[PDB]
């Protein structure tokens, strides 16, 4: 009967589980927010270095003036045409897969 093995109040076991699950959720939120902020810091660092390189190139050009864009535009036009064609080629494949699925669905309803 004198051996009472009261292993806590089933209440303390439920509370510990709820607190553990709450701490786990909070650690996931801290992880997500820290990962997001790390992304923003990395993007801002890149933008600052590109900003410094742009200032340095302008300063170097100004120094040389006191002592290209067409090729880049052709490359941008080429890349845009490539993206348009690749989107069309994927759309044409999806249209063919869609037509085949419609035919098979008609064949399965015609028995």
């Amino acid at each position: 009967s004198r051996a009472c093995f009261q292993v806590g109040s089933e209440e303390e076991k439920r509370q510990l589980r709820t607190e553990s699950d709450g701490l786990h959720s909070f650690f996931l939120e801290i992880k997500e927010t820290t990962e997001s902020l790390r992304g923003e810091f990395s993007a801002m660092k890149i933008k600052n270095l590109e900003g410094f390189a742009s200032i340095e190139d302008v300063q170097q050009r100004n120094k040389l003036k006191q002592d290209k864009s067409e090729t880049q535009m052709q490359e941008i036009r080429r890349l845009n045409q490539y993206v348009k064609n690749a989107v069309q080629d994927v759309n044409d494949v999806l249209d063919l897969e869609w037509d085949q699925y419609l035919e098979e669905k008609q064949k399965k309803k015609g028995i």
């Binding site: 820290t34 801002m44 933008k47 900003g51 989107v87």
Partner: protein, 680 residues
């Protein structure tokens, strides 16, 4: 759980048993002193049965059954200690002393069995609000039918040794009579004078060509068949019938001789084939014993096990547990000479275990030489309807229960293919049956036993599982039985059967062969118990001193070792587990506090880092805006204006194309989700 115990106490105190005790005293008072001494050799009997939750008790003086509805005793009815007793009167009473009552498989007939005759009582119809006999009439006349009466009246030396019902629930009830002439006689309740089948148990290998009046020379030589019992319905071995493609099924009847010799016979009442009813054996017993397993065999029980397990009981209290083995076809290399071209595959008996019952309580006397008065008595075996590997033994001095603890391992081994050496090693690991002395009616040597007059096991969903015993002094003893040979341990509060924790138990605990619970169960395993002691109510002396002190010493030792010491060990283990769980809970609460503080600190550091990042971004935007102003102040061709228009037009085309690609991707992911829903 609490509603189950009320009817057992109410039955033990029932007015019926007080009334039977009063009549027994009135009859004992009328008997002369010489008849009182012969009447004190009270024989073992079985004068009770249970039908649909009514207890039927045979009264030999009234030639009637008293019926007690056990389910009505469970209802705390504030009103009259007589609501539910009925009396079933024999229309023609037995002319012989009834020693046994047998309920038919169809539950419509009761055989009243004595050494000088058999009579069958037809059970009356149940009707009315309570499902009582003949609608609740206090006294019901029951039709009685004498079986084979002329044979017992004409043959005064003939004794009925045993009667058994043919084990069919679907056929008309047939009664098999084993008599002291070594003849089995099968009777149908439609023809009471002519046996349906007569089977001589004498080996018919004396073909001397004279038809008439062969006395069984075996019965005259002292070889008498003492007991028989049916095994479950079995397919006949290949060879028991030339050329039928149909698996013929028959009941195996095992037949025990006083010599321990066991025979087998297949009985089917529907088919009179020459092979169905041939006596087979004696069945060879293995291993060979020096005493051939004794010469005082008194009872046989087939357990409804696969393979069949036969229990053979001796008057000395030995119980042999025999596994029935199928006969082998002799592999073709020891053809040395049997000229009998009928290979009947004779099954063998493997004696797996032998057990001695404590028929009388053994006292340690310091005189190892005071004549073991071998307290021999006939044992009656009773199948347990709830546990097929358990049975009960009743004898003049008490009741035992025997549970075959190796049965489930034998079943596992025989279900394992020929390559499982581990299952054979697990079966060969010494495991004794469990014997429990439940009731002792001869607790002291100076006391006469109180013989068991009736024994039954209730298996009912409402009443639960309970043993009923009635003694020769009409003491009703009711005991709850477990549904298993070993009670399942109550689940530990820590046995969460979470089938979702593949928690890698650290390999250091894998070397403890078995869960710690099996080890503790091993320590708490009992080999003996103190029986319930019946104080036989022979008013006229207090019992005696040395033998009394030895009996008390033995009983106290069993209580110390099997109860107190095991309870103390279990309490220490529970307390150790509770202390460990408290310390583990405290550590987990501290870790949870630490993790909450670390989460708070990490949150505050993330907030401070986010503030610094926004300040750094604002300063960078200000620097960019200052750079844009300086660049504008420094700035303040027709081909560059046209290239700027063309670049702005291509950027608008790229934004349109990016929107079209995003629209195509959304249509593809919608089609993929529709194709996944079309393949379920």
């Amino acid at each position: 759980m609490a509603a189950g115990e009320h009817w057992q106490s109410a039955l033990s105190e029932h007015a019926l048993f007080s009334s039977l005790k009063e009549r027994l005293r009135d009859v004992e008072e009328l008997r002369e002193e010489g008849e009182r001494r012969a009447s004190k050799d009270k024989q073992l009997r079985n004068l009770l049965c249970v039908l649909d939750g009514d207890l039927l008790v045979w009264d030999a003086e009234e030639c009637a059954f008293h019926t007690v509805t056990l389910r009505s005793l469970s209802v705390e009815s504030t009103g009259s200690s007589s609501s539910g007793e009925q009396k079933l009167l024999c229309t023609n009473p037995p002319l012989f002393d009834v020693n046994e009552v047998l309920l038919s498989p169809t539950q419509h007939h009761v055989a009243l069995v004595g050494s000088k005759g058999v009579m069958v009582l037809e059970i009356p119809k149940r009707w009315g609000k309570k499902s009582e006999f003949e609608g609740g009439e206090k006294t019901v006349n029951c039709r009685t039918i004498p079986i084979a009466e002329r044979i017992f009246t004409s043959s005064t030396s003939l004794l009925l040794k045993q009667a058994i019902w043919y084990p069919s629930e679907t056929q008309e009830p047939h009664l098999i009579l084993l008599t002291s002439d070594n003849i089995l006689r099968l009777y149908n309740l439609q023809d009471l004078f002519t046996p349906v089948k007569v089977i001589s148990l004498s080996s018919a290998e004396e073909e001397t060509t004279l038809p008439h009046n062969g006395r069984s020379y075996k019965a005259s030589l002292g070889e008498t068949a003492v007991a028989c019992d049916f095994g479950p319905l079995a397919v006949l071995p290949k060879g028991f019938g030339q050329h039928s493609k149909e698996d013929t099924v028959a009941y195996p009847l095992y037949i025990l001789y006083e010599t321990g010799e066991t025979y087998l016979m297949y009985i089917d009442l529907q088919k009179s084939n020459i092979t169905v009813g041939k006596l087979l054996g004696p069945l060879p017993m293995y291993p060979a014993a020096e005493d051939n397993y004794g010469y005082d065999a008194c009872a046989l029980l087939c357990l409804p096990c696969v393979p069949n397990i036969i229990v053979i009981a001796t008057e000395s209290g030995l119980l042999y547990h025999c596994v029935v083995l199928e006969g082998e076809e002799d592999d073709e290399q020891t053809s040395n000479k049997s000229w009998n071209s009928s290979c009947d595959l004779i099954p063998s008996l493997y004696v797996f275990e032998c057990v001695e019952l404590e028929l009388a309580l053994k006292f340690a006397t310091e005189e190892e030489e005071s004549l073991e008065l071998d307290f021999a008595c006939p044992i009656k075996l009773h199948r347990d309807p709830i546990c097929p590997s358990r049975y009960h033994c009743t004898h003049v001095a008490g009741v035992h229960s025997v549970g075959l603890t190796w049965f489930n391992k034998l079943e596992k081994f025989l279900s394992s293919g020929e390559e499982d050496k581990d299952s054979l090693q697990e079966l060969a690991a010494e495991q004794k049956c469990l014997v429990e002395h439940i009731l002792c009616t001869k607790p002291l040597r100076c006391r006469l036993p109180s013989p068991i007059q009736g024994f039954w096991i209730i298996s009912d969903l409402f009443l639960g599982t309970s043993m009923i015993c009635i003694t020769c002094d009409f003491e009703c003893i009711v005991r709850p039985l477990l549904t298993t040979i070993r009670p399942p341990s109550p689940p530990l509060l820590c046995s969460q059967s979470d089938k979702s924790s593949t928690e890698i138990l650290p390999h250091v605990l894998a070397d403890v062969k078995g869960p710690f619970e099996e080890h503790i169960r091993g320590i708490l395993r009992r080999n003996s118990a103190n029986p319930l002691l019946l104080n036989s109510s022979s008013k006229d002396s207090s019992p005696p001193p040395e033998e009394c002190l030895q009996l008390l010493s033995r009983a106290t030792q069993v209580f110390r070792e099997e109860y107190l010491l095991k309870q103390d060990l279990a309490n220490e283990e529970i307390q150790r587990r509770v202390k460990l769980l408290i310390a583990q809970k405290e550590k987990q609460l501290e870790d949870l506090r630490y993790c909450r503080e670390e989460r708070k600190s990490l949150t505050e550091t993330a907030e401070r880092l986010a503030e610094k990042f926004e300040e750094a971004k604002e300063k960078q935007e200000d620097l960019i805006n200052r750079l844009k102003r300086i660049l504008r102040s420094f700035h303040t061709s027709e081909s560059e204006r046209d290239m700027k228009k063309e670049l702005q037009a291509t950027n608008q085309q790229l934004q349109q194309l990016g929107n079209s690609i995003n629209q195509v991707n959304r249509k593809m992911s919608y089609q993929e989700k529709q194709m996944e829903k079309g393949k379920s």
